[model samples]
Target: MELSFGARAELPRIHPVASKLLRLMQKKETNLCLSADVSLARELLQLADALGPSICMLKTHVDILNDFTLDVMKELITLAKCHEFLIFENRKFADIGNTVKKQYEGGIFKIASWADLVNAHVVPGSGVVKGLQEVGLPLHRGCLLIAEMSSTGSLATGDYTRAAVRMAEEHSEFVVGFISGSRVSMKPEFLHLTPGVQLEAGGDNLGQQYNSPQEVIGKRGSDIIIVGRGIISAADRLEAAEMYRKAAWEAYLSRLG
Candidate 1:
C-alpha cells in the first residue's frame, strides 16, 4: 500500500539505519534491493557492481558463497559505498544471547563489522535481539525482526507477530522494523522489508511466493522490496535490475500521494 503523505514524513524520525536507507532512496530515487543469493563469490560481486547504481541495498547470504572470504566482503563494501547502498545480511539468526553474540562477532562472516542491517527471528525471545544489540550497536547496525514471512505455510502470524512487534518497539534502538507481509502494521518510524517480490511469477513449488513491486510497496506499504531470482536469474541482470528499480520507485512515489 502507498504510504500516506504523513507516513512518508515520518521517515526522518526513524532510526539511523532506516533513515539512511530512505535518504539513499530519495537521493538515488530507487528502492530496489538485489538479493544476491548466488552460491559463488564471483557471481555475487558481479551482481553487486552491475546492479549497484540502481539499488538502495544488496541483500546477501554470505555464508552460502562457495568461496567466502574477507576480500569478497571488502569488495562488496566498496561497491556499496561507491554505489551508495546498504548491505543487508540475511542471517535469520535464531538462538540464545550468548550463542548469537558469538555467531554475529566470532564467525568467519563477522557480520557485526560489515552488515548495515541484519535480520533475526524473535522465537529465541528478547535475548536474541539483545545479543545482536550488544554487537550491532557499537558498529551502528540495524535489525529487522521476522514478524510475518511471505512464504506459504510460514508460522509467523497473529499473536506471534504482535509479540514480535512489541519486542521491536521495546528495543527500537537496534530493531528497525520487520520482514513481513502487508498485514502487519508498524509505527511509521519503523519500516518493512518485504521479500518474495517478482514482476511475473506466482510461487515456487518449494513454498516461496511472489508479489509485484506494486503489490508489496503500493498495496503492502513495504519500504523496501527484496527480490532474488527475479532479478538475479534474469536473461540480462542489469536490465532486469533496472526494471525493478523503476517499478519500485514509481510504486513508492504513488504511495506518497
Candidate 2:
C-alpha cells in the first residue's frame, strides 16, 4: 500500500510534537508507545524510564496518579528529553471553549506546560478545538481528537466520526489527527493513532477490545499503534515492549512497501 511516505518527507507539514515523534520513530527504529497507566507516580516514572529509549512516545493518565507532583512531570520531561520520545497525556478533555482553556493551561496540572501531546473529544464541537488551539498552538503541542474509540458499544462512529475529522481539518494547527479505529480517509498530513494493539486477544470482561499491530498499521492504515496493558502488564515489561516495538515497526515498514 505504501501508505506513509516515511517520516522524513512528512515532517515539515505536521506540528513539532508530531514531527518529533516521527523522527524518534525513525531514529530509534521503533514505533512503540508505552501507555504508562500505573497508579503511582514512582511506578509510572520507573516504567517510562525503563521503556523510554525503546519507544516513540509515553502515554500517560496524569489524573490517575496517587501522588502526582510538578517534580514528577519534571522528571518525566527529563527522561523524555534524554530518551528522545514524546509525552502524551491522555486527558481526553471534552468541554466548552472557556472551560477547556482553564483545564489545559490554568490548572495545577498545567497540561500545556508539560505534555508534548494530548487527546480530546469533539463532542463539544468546534469551540473545543478553538480553546485547545489558543493554548497549544504557541507551545507547539499536538492534539489528537477522539474520532473513534476501541471500546465496545462506543458512540464515536458514523456521522460523529466524520464530524471529528472535519473539526481537525478546520483547525489543523492544534488538531493534528485522531485516535481512531480502522483505516479512515483523513488527509495524509494528519496522523491516525490506533489503540488496543495486542498480539493475542481474548479481550477482558470490560468493554475494551484488542487488535494486532499488523491489523492497525497494515490493514487499517494507522500511522501509529498504541498498546497499553499488552506490554506493560507482561511478566517482563521491557522485553514485551521490545517485542511489540519490533512487530509494529515491521508492520509499518511493510505497509510502506
Index of the highest-lDDT prediction: 1
Return the lDDT, model 1, position 58: 97
Give the TM-score comparing model 1 with the true structure, all chains together.
Answer: 0.94
> By TM-score, how accurate is candidate 2?
0.95
RMSD of 1: 2.1
**Candidate 2 on 134-165: residue-level lDDT in tens?**
99888999898999999899999999999988
- Candidate 2: list runs displaced more than 4 Å: 1-12
Q: What is the lDDT of residue 42 in candidate 2?
A: 86
What overall lDDT, based on C-alpha atoms, would model 2 receive against the true structure? 0.84
Residue by residue across 44-145, what tens digits does model 1's lDDT show?
998898889999999999878889988899999999999999999998999999899989987778888889999999998999999989999988899999
